[PDB]
Predict the 3D structure of the following.
Amino acid sequence: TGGSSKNLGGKSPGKRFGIKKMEGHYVHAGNILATQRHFRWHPGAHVGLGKNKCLYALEEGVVRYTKEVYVPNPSNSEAVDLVTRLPQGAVLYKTFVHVVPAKPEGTFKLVAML
RNA sequence: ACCAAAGCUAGCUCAACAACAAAUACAAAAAUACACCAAAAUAAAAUAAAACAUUCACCUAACAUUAAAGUAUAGGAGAUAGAAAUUUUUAUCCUGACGCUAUAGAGAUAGUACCGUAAGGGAAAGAUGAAAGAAUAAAAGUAAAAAAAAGCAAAGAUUACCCCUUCUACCUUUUGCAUAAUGGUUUAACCAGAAAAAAUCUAACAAAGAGAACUUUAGCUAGAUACCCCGAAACCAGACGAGCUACCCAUGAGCAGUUUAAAAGAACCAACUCAUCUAUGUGGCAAAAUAGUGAGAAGACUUGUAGGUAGAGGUGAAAAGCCUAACGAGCCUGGUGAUAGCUGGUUGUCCGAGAAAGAAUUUUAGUUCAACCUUAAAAAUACCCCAAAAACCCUAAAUUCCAAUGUAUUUUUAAGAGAUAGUCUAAAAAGGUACAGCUUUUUAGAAACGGAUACAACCUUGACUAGAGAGUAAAUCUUAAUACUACCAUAGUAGGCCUAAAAGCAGCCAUCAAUUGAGAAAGCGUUAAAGCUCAACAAAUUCACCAACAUAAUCCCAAAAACUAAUAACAAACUCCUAGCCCAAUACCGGACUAAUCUAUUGAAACAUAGAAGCAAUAAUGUUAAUAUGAGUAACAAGAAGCCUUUCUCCUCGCACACGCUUACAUCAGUAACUAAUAAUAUACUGAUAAUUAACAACCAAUAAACCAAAACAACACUAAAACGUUUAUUAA
RNA sequence: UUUACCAAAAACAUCACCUCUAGCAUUACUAGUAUUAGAGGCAAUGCCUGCCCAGUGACAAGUUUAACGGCCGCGGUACUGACCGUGCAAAGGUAGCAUAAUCACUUGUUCUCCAAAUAAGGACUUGUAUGAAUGGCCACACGAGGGUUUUACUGUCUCUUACUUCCAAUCAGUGAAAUUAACCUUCCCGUGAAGAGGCGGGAAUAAAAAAAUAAGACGAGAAGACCCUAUGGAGCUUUAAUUAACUAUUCCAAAAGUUCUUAACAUGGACUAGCAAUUUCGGUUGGGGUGACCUCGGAGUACAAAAAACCCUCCGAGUGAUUUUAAUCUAGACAAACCAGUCAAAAUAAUCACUUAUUGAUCCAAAAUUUUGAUCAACGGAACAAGUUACCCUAGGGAUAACAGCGCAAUCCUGUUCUAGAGUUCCUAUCGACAAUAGGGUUUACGACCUCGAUGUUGGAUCAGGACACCCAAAUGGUGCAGCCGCUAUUAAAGGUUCGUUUGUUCAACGAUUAAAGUCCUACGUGAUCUGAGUUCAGACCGGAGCAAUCCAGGUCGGUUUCUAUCUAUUAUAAAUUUCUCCCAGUACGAAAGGACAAGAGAAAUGGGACCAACCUCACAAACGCGUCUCAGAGAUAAUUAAUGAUUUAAUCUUAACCUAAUUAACUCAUAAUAAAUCCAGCCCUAGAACAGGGCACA
Ligand SMILES: [Mg+2]
Ligand SMILES: [Mg+2]
Ligand SMILES: [Mg+2]
Ligand SMILES: [Mg+2]
Ligand SMILES: [Mg+2]
Ligand SMILES: [Mg+2]
Ligand SMILES: [Mg+2]
Ligand SMILES: [Mg+2]
Ligand SMILES: [Mg+2]
Ligand SMILES: [Mg+2]
Ligand SMILES: [Mg+2]
Ligand SMILES: [Mg+2]
Ligand SMILES: [Mg+2]
Ligand SMILES: [Mg+2]
Ligand SMILES: [Mg+2]
Ligand SMILES: [Mg+2]
Ligand SMILES: [Mg+2]
Ligand SMILES: [Mg+2]
Ligand SMILES: [Mg+2]
Ligand SMILES: [Mg+2]
Ligand SMILES: [Mg+2]
Ligand SMILES: [Mg+2]
Ligand SMILES: [Mg+2]
Ligand SMILES: [Mg+2]
Ligand SMILES: [Mg+2]
Ligand SMILES: [Mg+2]
Ligand SMILES: [Mg+2]
Ligand SMILES: [Mg+2]
Ligand SMILES: [Mg+2]
Ligand SMILES: [Mg+2]
Ligand SMILES: [Mg+2]
Ligand SMILES: [Mg+2]
Ligand SMILES: [Mg+2]
Ligand SMILES: [Mg+2]
Ligand SMILES: [Mg+2]
Ligand SMILES: [Mg+2]
Ligand SMILES: [Mg+2]
Ligand SMILES: [Mg+2]
Ligand SMILES: [Mg+2]
Ligand SMILES: [Mg+2]
Ligand SMILES: [Mg+2]
Ligand SMILES: [Mg+2]
Ligand SMILES: [Mg+2]
Ligand SMILES: [Mg+2]
Ligand SMILES: [Mg+2]
Ligand SMILES: [Mg+2]
Ligand SMILES: [Mg+2]
Ligand SMILES: [Mg+2]
Ligand SMILES: [Mg+2]
Ligand SMILES: [Mg+2]
Ligand SMILES: [Mg+2]
Ligand SMILES: [Mg+2]
Ligand SMILES: [Mg+2]
Ligand SMILES: [Mg+2]
Ligand SMILES: [Mg+2]
Ligand SMILES: [Mg+2]
Ligand SMILES: [Mg+2]
Ligand SMILES: [Mg+2]
Ligand SMILES: [Mg+2]
Ligand SMILES: [Mg+2]
Ligand SMILES: [Mg+2]
Ligand SMILES: [Mg+2]
Ligand SMILES: [Mg+2]
Ligand SMILES: [Mg+2]
Ligand SMILES: [Mg+2]
Ligand SMILES: [Mg+2]
Ligand SMILES: [Mg+2]
Ligand SMILES: [Mg+2]
Ligand SMILES: [Mg+2]
Ligand SMILES: [Mg+2]
Ligand SMILES: [Mg+2]
Ligand SMILES: [Mg+2]
Ligand SMILES: [Mg+2]
Ligand SMILES: [Mg+2]
Ligand SMILES: [Mg+2]
Ligand SMILES: [Mg+2]
Ligand SMILES: [Mg+2]
Ligand SMILES: [Mg+2]
Ligand SMILES: [Mg+2]
Ligand SMILES: [Mg+2]
Ligand SMILES: [Mg+2]
Ligand SMILES: [Mg+2]
Ligand SMILES: [Mg+2]
Ligand SMILES: [Mg+2]
Ligand SMILES: [Mg+2]
Ligand SMILES: [Mg+2]
Ligand SMILES: [Mg+2]
Ligand SMILES: [Mg+2]
Ligand SMILES: [Mg+2]
Ligand SMILES: [Mg+2]
Ligand SMILES: [Mg+2]
Ligand SMILES: [Mg+2]
Ligand SMILES: [Mg+2]
Ligand SMILES: [Mg+2]
Ligand SMILES: [Mg+2]
Ligand SMILES: [Mg+2]
Ligand SMILES: [Mg+2]
Ligand SMILES: [Mg+2]
Ligand SMILES: [Mg+2]
Ligand SMILES: [Mg+2]
Ligand SMILES: [Mg+2]
Ligand SMILES: [Mg+2]
Ligand SMILES: [Mg+2]
Ligand SMILES: [Mg+2]
Ligand SMILES: [Mg+2]
Ligand SMILES: [Mg+2]
Ligand SMILES: [Mg+2]
Ligand SMILES: [Mg+2]
Ligand SMILES: [Mg+2]
Ligand SMILES: [Mg+2]
Ligand SMILES: [Mg+2]
Ligand SMILES: [Mg+2]
Ligand SMILES: [Mg+2]
Ligand SMILES: [Mg+2]
Ligand SMILES: [Mg+2]
Ligand SMILES: [Mg+2]
Ligand SMILES: [Mg+2]
Ligand SMILES: [Mg+2]
Ligand SMILES: [Mg+2]
Ligand SMILES: [Mg+2]
Ligand SMILES: [Mg+2]
């Protein structure tokens, strides 16, 4: 009996998208925080956005997650319109990641007393 | 008590040093007549490359030894292969043995018996003593000594052998084996893990270490720790084979009768040749037969002796036939311990810890990485883990991540393997038939010697060794199902409407109104009527209603049971108790001891410290020897009587030669045991002695020349055109 | 003439007929010379041999089929199509013959042949897959070829029998073989790696010999010839991929001479062929083949961190479109077996197309100053290799098929529950759509769980064990049952359940009968009892498919069936069944036409048990059938009919009493067999394999 199943190429590995660090994790500058294919979490304070929508930590610190108000860039039109048609009482919210800096910025050392 | 058992020698390993005489290549072993001689062309493949085409060390040569160096180079630049320049080396003498004892060591008492036509293969065995010029009772198997209901053959035990009670042979192989999967009759003797790069361990000397060349940021140098056995079909080179069979070339030989003018690939039918059909036979009488029955039988006929063609070939009236009792390609010896991701085997004891499949792959019967894990080391946190936190429409069980806290685990570093062919149970889903002892993933569990009788996965429990102590755990199998009863029945009016009729009761409309009470009717009934009951009083009594489901093939499947009181009792490897040497296991990996040899010193009767190894067989359809079982079974043979070679009774491959065998033949003697498949006695066993006598048969000249004229009862012919010598001359001991 | 040893044939050869290739001398052919000699085809004779040079050949562009090989559509029209249109071809299958030793349908149609024929012969005949030297068609004569009829003959058979001889069993000699874990070696039903002498629950059971029979020990023999798998082999064939030697060819050099030639040898490099070499023939797969797929990404499966399978369900990619040319160097990271993949601060000075996928490692090649090279798509990639094997071989596997078992029950098979409907009226006498719920385990499948160091597989023969979902016989309910037949339903397994023609056949048709000529299971019972016609190896044709080798669950002809029994098992008690007659009574029953049971007498037949006076077989005094004899009481109940009679004062056979009654098969048992303990040497026997048993006083 002809057993042809017409479907092809279901097979891909998973991309291991997801959250790499968790709230209250210590982080060094450069660590990737989470990696996603669509924006699930947006970059907050001290979190840089990679061209593939990676989130990495800019400072040395503690990673925090947050629900905050979303005010799209006036250059990006779709989001501008989505913001436009809302009923007059409602604001948009999203989830952000943050780094909270640990090390102080610097120190004043006494080099020489002349 | 038989059968058996034991010796220590014959000789071997490895290494230093350095009886002529005759006869013979005629068909070897034969004194002697005319010739010829003599010759040479790369090694290939098996195998590595996980296939296979280029390529694959060693295999011929010498060159040795310490180095340069596994370096320069050469390679489907893969596998692997691999120099030189230049360097080093003191003499002989000084022989032996941590080499084997008769399944070893030579194959050897022998290249012999024997097996092959031939090249070639190739065994087995000996044991007393000074003297034979003296005559231990320990393997299996059996005997002494048949066997008495029952059941992996034992164990717990008992006064007692049984009788009771408790237990699925062992290996290998698998997901899982009592399996009705493989292996083995039993005994003995043989019969299977080898390497030192990196590492660890123990020592030397140390900024150096090594008895030369090298390596060095604690290193070097030395020791010690390591990696099997048996199997193809094949492929390549060189020999040997045509005494079988295939086909040829020589030289011979058969074919009677009967029929026909006939030797005409004609008839009939013997000898002779084939092999049709059936039955016997099947470890046979026979590695292809016998009995009957059949085909051909002067021809493409059968058959004897002697040549020839040889495997990359020959031969073939093609059957891929035949070429020496296996031919899709002979046999033998080499290559050759060919190569097997594939079976099958792999030998002492006792302890520690212990594994289930993520990737790639001519890969899915295999490897190599990760993860888990084992053995050492260094460290610091590891599991558990409350808020807090992880997405956008709907979205359960739950994950991820972390302090406290309960515990001791986890990570790194250095070495290593196996494993990577899983099963079921619960849960979430797919596919299929909302089927599988079905298949495919994800999360858990399990693989008791206790329960579910029996039992791999379910349930109770985790583990040692003794006790003729205790407490408990899971669990023994129960549960049910019934009835319907009075008495009575007139009215408009067969209401309209339809319709053959239509009268409650074919369908539409209406649902009215007498009686105290009876529907313009819920059933059947009739063509329509007619007729039966239900609803309505009257008389009474009232208690219910939610009903159930045939069978399989050897022979039903503990026996039984309503009851003396139960939060019983009885029940494990669990847990107490009394003592300890103090807690399971396949692959793989760590440790501690020791059996038997030999060598160093001890030891003296069995030895104890070391060093060494041919270092330990219950399993390979293992090898050899010997024993059983089947089994005293299958099967084998001699015509009668006498006075002992004389008569009888029956059936018919007989005497010579050729080839081939070699004393098997003849006489006398002996036969306990060897040969005869048994006896008697002897042509076939043993000893001694003899024997076949040449006129038959073998051996036995050349060169010239004449000669066209078949055998066939041979007159003469036929087509297919036929084997064979006389005579003359020249010389011939 | 052939497969010495499974096939003597239709296979091969062969007279004859045709194609090719050759013009010549010392070893073949050949001491030959084209009427000859070599390669072949096809098979006498007779009548024939159609059309086709486009492919591949082969020859010396052209030529060739008695070379390899081919020889059609589509529709329109007088049920058909002589005609018609248009298309493609190198030509369009003709003369014959025909259901065939010719794919299937298919047991074609019909006649003859028989009581009956899937056989045989004759016809028709599109054979859509005949067909003319890979020969087509008739015909003598011949086949140990295949098929069919008749005569005749008979032990083939109805349906067996007697007697001899070899074996045979007892005595005496001699004395093997495969095989064997150990066995102190039962039966049943369960269980279990799915078929138990060993497990569980029950049964049964002094001990050993000899003789028999073959159900079991997945019996004994051969490390399965089937199947699949090894990066195992080999033989065969070509368009597989790489290509020598050789034999021939053609050419250029060389060599000799000429001013362009080659006599025979003969070397270097080519070419073109023949013969010929070396090596392979990927993988997944609910066995393999055929089919399909092999890398890369989005969804689902996989619901909320990651991961996550299938020959799972669905969509995509092997690049475009631009402009703005999207740079160096280095912290920290994700991911990850490895290889590859990803983000990215500081320091110096690409976008849109769901956007995610648009891609290939080393080595080796070309390039310039630096870099580009693949349906390597089997996508972690061998620098370059296909077909076959039924002539096959080895290593393995029950890791995986075919047989059988087991699981499951889609399909199949028996019931019930529900009434629409049929049945004129009437659901359920006889049935019954759409549907519900239980069962059975034989079918075709599906799984791959035991077996590949063998569990030998279809149909018969013989002998049967069992189920009951009764085909007969036996009791009964209902009827759209007057009676006779019937049609349905309930209870009953002791006994039965035929002989033929055609097929290998179970099935099926058909002839003739029977009381009936059941449906099943038992390894589709039964091959250490038998038979192999069939499937299923080697030979061979004929369609077809391939260029071939070979091949098609397509036909046809032919073709080895081995075991001496160790163990378990087993090796004779009886106590009938069925017809058909004759009667009754031509009566009961119906308007008549047709027409019964029950009771009672007879005959047979079959099955048990025996026996020879006759007959028949008989050369023994016996054995034997074709001949003769003899065959049973009582008790029980199943389904169903009735009486008294309560719960419930009527009723009511009652899963209420008490007695009851009527009625099958089994199954019991009356009755029958056997049944005196020990002398046994001999010798007789109607008794016997041995041992046992009966006789041996007359007479
Ligand atoms: Mg996906
Ligand atoms: Mg995946
Ligand atoms: Mg190789
Ligand atoms: Mg190998
Ligand atoms: Mg190979
Ligand atoms: Mg070599
Ligand atoms: Mg020796
Ligand atoms: Mg000899
Ligand atoms: Mg003994
Ligand atoms: Mg016992
Ligand atoms: Mg078991
Ligand atoms: Mg074994
Ligand atoms: Mg298995
Ligand atoms: Mg079994
Ligand atoms: Mg077996
Ligand atoms: Mg096996
Ligand atoms: Mg055996
Ligand atoms: Mg070392
Ligand atoms: Mg050190
Ligand atoms: Mg080779
Ligand atoms: Mg090879
Ligand atoms: Mg010869
Ligand atoms: Mg000869
Ligand atoms: Mg004659
Ligand atoms: Mg003749
Ligand atoms: Mg005869
Ligand atoms: Mg004859
Ligand atoms: Mg004849
Ligand atoms: Mg011949
Ligand atoms: Mg042939
Ligand atoms: Mg053949
Ligand atoms: Mg031979
Ligand atoms: Mg080997
Ligand atoms: Mg590959
Ligand atoms: Mg493999
Ligand atoms: Mg923590
Ligand atoms: Mg498997
Ligand atoms: Mg594997
Ligand atoms: Mg079950
Ligand atoms: Mg698990
Ligand atoms: Mg138990
Ligand atoms: Mg304990
Ligand atoms: Mg009225
Ligand atoms: Mg009223
Ligand atoms: Mg206890
Ligand atoms: Mg342990
Ligand atoms: Mg040893
Ligand atoms: Mg031993
Ligand atoms: Mg054997
Ligand atoms: Mg052994
Ligand atoms: Mg014996
Ligand atoms: Mg016997
Ligand atoms: Mg005998
Ligand atoms: Mg005799
Ligand atoms: Mg002689
Ligand atoms: Mg003798
Ligand atoms: Mg012959
Ligand atoms: Mg033969
Ligand atoms: Mg024959
Ligand atoms: Mg012929
Ligand atoms: Mg000619
Ligand atoms: Mg002809
Ligand atoms: Mg023609
Ligand atoms: Mg025609
Ligand atoms: Mg046909
Ligand atoms: Mg044709
Ligand atoms: Mg032709
Ligand atoms: Mg033809
Ligand atoms: Mg003739
Ligand atoms: Mg003939
Ligand atoms: Mg004939
Ligand atoms: Mg005897
Ligand atoms: Mg017994
Ligand atoms: Mg079972
Ligand atoms: Mg059983
Ligand atoms: Mg006997
Ligand atoms: Mg038997
Ligand atoms: Mg057994
Ligand atoms: Mg059997
Ligand atoms: Mg095998
Ligand atoms: Mg193969
Ligand atoms: Mg191969
Ligand atoms: Mg080669
Ligand atoms: Mg393939
Ligand atoms: Mg495959
Ligand atoms: Mg398949
Ligand atoms: Mg399957
Ligand atoms: Mg395919
Ligand atoms: Mg920057
Ligand atoms: Mg390239
Ligand atoms: Mg591949
Ligand atoms: Mg791949
Ligand atoms: Mg990949
Ligand atoms: Mg054939
Ligand atoms: Mg084999
Ligand atoms: Mg299996
Ligand atoms: Mg079977
Ligand atoms: Mg099956
Ligand atoms: Mg079975
Ligand atoms: Mg069922
Ligand atoms: Mg099924
Ligand atoms: Mg499976
Ligand atoms: Mg098998
Ligand atoms: Mg066996
Ligand atoms: Mg029967
Ligand atoms: Mg019944
Ligand atoms: Mg019966
Ligand atoms: Mg059968
Ligand atoms: Mg059979
Ligand atoms: Mg049998
Ligand atoms: Mg053909
Ligand atoms: Mg025949
Ligand atoms: Mg046949
Ligand atoms: Mg037989
Ligand atoms: Mg016996
Ligand atoms: Mg027998
Ligand atoms: Mg009788
Ligand atoms: Mg009453
Ligand atoms: Mg009454
Ligand atoms: Mg009795
Ligand atoms: Mg007596």
Q: What stands out?
A: The first strand of chain A starts at residue 18 and ends at 19. Strands of chain A lie at 18-19, 26-27, 32-35, 41-43, 47-49, 54-57, 61-69, 93-101. Residues 1-20, 22, 28-32, 35, 37, 48, 50-52, 54, 56-58 of chain A lie near RNA strand C (CB under 10 Å from a C1'). Residues 77-85 of chain A form the longest helix (9 residues).
